[PDB]
Amino acid sequence: LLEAGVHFGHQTRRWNPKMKRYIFTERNGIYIIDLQKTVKKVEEAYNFTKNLAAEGGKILFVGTKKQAQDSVKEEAQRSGMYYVNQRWLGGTLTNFETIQKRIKRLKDIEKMQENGTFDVLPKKEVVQLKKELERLEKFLGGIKDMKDLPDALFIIDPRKERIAVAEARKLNIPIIGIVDTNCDPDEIDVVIPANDDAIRAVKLLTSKMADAILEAKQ
RNA sequence: UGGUUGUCGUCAGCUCGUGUCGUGAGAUGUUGGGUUAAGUCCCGCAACGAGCGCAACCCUUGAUCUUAGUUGCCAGCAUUCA
């Protein structure tokens, strides 16, 4: 674990008191996360992600934070599961039907590029249907092949991704969440008390879940 | 009284559904950052590509192609006052 920077939390002025149960001491005006609770909390997560994948359940990684974007993506694609990496769209889950309508439309613009329909209309169309595609793939490229709602979310930094959390709860979707000290643990079903700010930390902890999907599929 | 006249005729916006926010009336998107002649456009953002009015749809003029060459046209030939 801590070669990767997981133990390091946020400062003391931005704690949440519910994270007291997961904190072991403050040093240079930063809380330290208790690695002996982490490991067990990572192990409990790992079994819950393993069991869920073996039932054929679909997990949606969600890391819009600059230090999760690439991590999430690489680990979602490796794991053959959905991601959101760029911006969580209001009503991604609750309003899933109206997103589905743009996943159709994105896939419909691709088929227009693949049949050479883009050579018949132009110049005006093509500008605005690349521009629509570029924009749609950006935001919806991770969830492109998700036909039905995910059976759980893997979140990173719930306090940034509040909307994703808020949504998941409203559909009783289980969530799996890297919480730093700042973050409320009670929102989340399976909690991983850890750094979300350090790239190695996230990359480590996502990868172990990805692994946990891959080992179920075997 | 009908109808038809004059007379305030453009002059400024209304939104996609569901989702979201409030006990509720409502608010959001359709408060922000630039931009345009603009009711424009991009970037936004618990709202998400983009919608109706606008414009266009009608008619006319500006270039050129295809078809049609007669009663139109004559460059190239015969002509003659033409």
Which letter, b or e, does each residue of A147-167 get, where b requires 16 or more Cβ atoms within 10 Å of its Cβ?
Answer: eeebebbbbbbbbbbebbbeb
8 A C-beta contact, residue A179 and residue A159: no
User: Other CB atoms closer than 10 Å to residue A87's CB: what's the count?
Assistant: 11
Residue A177 phi, psi (nearest 5):
-135, 120
Q: Give which of A143, A161, A142, A170 is closest to A202, Cα–Cα.
A: A161
Please give the backbone phi and psi of residue A34, each rounded to the nearest 5 degrees, phi first: -90, 105
Tokens at A7, concatenated: 């133990």
A187 DSSP assignment: T
For residue A218, the SS3 value is: coil
Q: Which protein residues, judged by their CB atom, are less than 7 Å from any atom of strand B? A: A 87-91, 94-95, 97-99, 101-102, 128, 131-132, 135-136, 139, 163, 166-167, 170
Closest nucleotide (C1' vs CA) to A109 is B49
Report how far residue A1's alpha carbon sits from residue A8's, in angstroms, rounded to the nearest whole number: 11
What letter would DSSP give residue A64? -
Rounded distance between C-alpha atoms, residue A78 and residue A72, angstroms:
10
Q: How far is the CA of A17 from the C1' of B42 (A)?
A: 43
Both ends of chain A: CA-CA distance in Å?
Answer: 26
Q: Structure tokens of A81? A: 């599961």
Largest Cα–Cα separation, chain A:
67
Beta strand pairing status for A152-156 and A82-84? unpaired
Residue A24 three-state SS: strand
The distance from CA A92 to its chain's CA centroid, rounded to whole angstroms, is 13
DSSP assignment of A141-166: STTTT--S--SEEEEE-TTTSHHHHH
Gap from A124 CA to B56 C1', Å:
16
Number of Cα atoms under 13 Å in the Cβ half of residue A79: 32
Written as six digits, the tokens of A6 are 């997981």
Nearest-10 Cα torsion for A117, A120, A124, A128: 0
Residue closest to sugar C1' of B44 by CA: A87
What sections of chain A are H helices per DSSP? 35-54, 69-79, 96-114, 124-140, 162-170, 199-217
Resolution for this experimental structure (Å) = 3.6
